[PDB]
Amino acid sequence: MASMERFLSVYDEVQAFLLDQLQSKYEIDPNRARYLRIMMDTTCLGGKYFRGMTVVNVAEGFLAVTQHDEATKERILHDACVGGWMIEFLQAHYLVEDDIMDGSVMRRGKPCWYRFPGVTTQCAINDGIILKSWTQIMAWHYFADRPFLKDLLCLFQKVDYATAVGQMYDVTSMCDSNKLDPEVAQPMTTDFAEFTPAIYKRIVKYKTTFYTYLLPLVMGLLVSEAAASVEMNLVERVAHLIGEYFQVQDDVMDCFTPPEQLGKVGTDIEDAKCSWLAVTFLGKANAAQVAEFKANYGEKDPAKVAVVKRLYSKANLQADFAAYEAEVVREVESLIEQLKVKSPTFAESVAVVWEKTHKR
Template sequence: IRYPPVLISCCCRVMFQLQAYFLVLDDIMDNSVTRRGQPCWFRVPQVGMVAINDGILLRNHIHRILKKHFRGKPYYVDLVDLFNEVEMQTACGQMIDLITTFEGEKDLAKYSLPIHRRIVQYKTAYYSFYLPVACALLMAGENLENHIDVKNVLVDMGIYFQVQDDYLDCFADPETLGKIGTDIEDFKCSWLVVKALERCSKEQTEILYANYGKPDPSNVAKVKELYKELDLEGVFKEYESKSYEKLTGVIEAHKSKAIQAVLKSFLAKIYKRQK
């Protein structure tokens, strides 16, 4: 199926606007400093908390674009439902992420891989990986209920992507990454801290508890040194290799060569990424 370029352009635009809306507000909630090598929008002089309203404007313009360009299409209602559902899922993921780092209730004991997966699945995987493919399927006249297997692969790919992000937040050069990682300072339920908790001795656990979630550079340095002692770089590389093999196997087992090609292109773009 060949779609009119204007429809493809509009669909891409609303997905970018949805992401921009999430990121503008996420940077405020995380008190981040940079985003893609530039100051976060709320840190730009004369913007400040006006950024909150800017985010709301981005979000509300999405449905104006969908209505203008897709209203007469047979899949319009399903497309609107998809965007609404993905937005709700992402907001739920953000909520879980925020309440696990709530000041005054910091407790590393509640962090685990299932909690991390839940946050990542809702906060990142649905809008970053599932949404683009789901839009294409709807525009091709497909019923999304018939492609649950594709959804599951994309969610797993999104989780792998976020584990990469957690790793890069700590180990990547900020100049290359385009942002300054703050997962340690922000007490995030990062894949790294969960794996550290699994591998720590009693003494190492005490070091982690004493320093994780504190903004002082000396505390952050102690956590990073502990991560190196635990060889979390090696643990991540093993995880990355196994994840790639597993995802490739699932993709190649799909009956549709066209869907295989799309999923393989997604995986190729993120495998061993550096930013």
């Protein structure tokens, strides 16, 4: 059975389990069970399942080189699928809440969940909470007697927290650190002094790389009982690297991918986000180019957004992006080679992850 089919079948399984448990133990009625079923489908399905499928792909790699009974192989695959869905649901939580936080309009070519007529923000904040609770309900149900449950929960926990810290880094990224104060309304930075590579790196590392790369990779290792096939420091480094590159890609696409292929009208410029484009532009701009960026960035006026987009195109950031990508390729290949010392199999799963990231 192909990996995708198996992963989707487990969705249906987990969904049925969660809805049936709500009826048998949480006194739910059928209409609310329905609403929740539709919330789950709308918020968790539709993407490429890159995260959840990474878990499955890492486990498939170990299965190919490890002696197991058939029933054991099926168990391990089922665990990987469940683990995968945990990470997908974790994502779904973050996306629902982030869309609300940011007043976003669309996500994947459909309206953000909170904008559905019969949802609203008052329900959507809670639906997002439920999404994350379901990760834990799944884990405790499917993984209760598993040797890895402790390590899996502890890692999951740390990643979730990292992700929320990262969200804070991100939503504050256009404030001046020295002025942050719950008592005082926050002005946008005027100097852009904190739009640096180190700062940008910190935002992306927490907000995306831990849940998008490190969690799927390590979860594949845990459900495989293979975390001692690998050097964990290397897993982190490669995760953080490919993860930053995934986010530079999304930053570039926010600005330049037309909205039909992006699945939304990007608003990083209007929102004054600390993007790779902005940091890189500021790292090469002359005094006049800086001054004009400052007059136009972080304002809703489309004329001003167009001045920023012009500045970017004429600063030839395409070239900086090629250089960035070349350096990431060097470093990723290097880390893969290092991974081969203790696990050729895991190194190859990491190669596959890199390839899928490179080609999206």
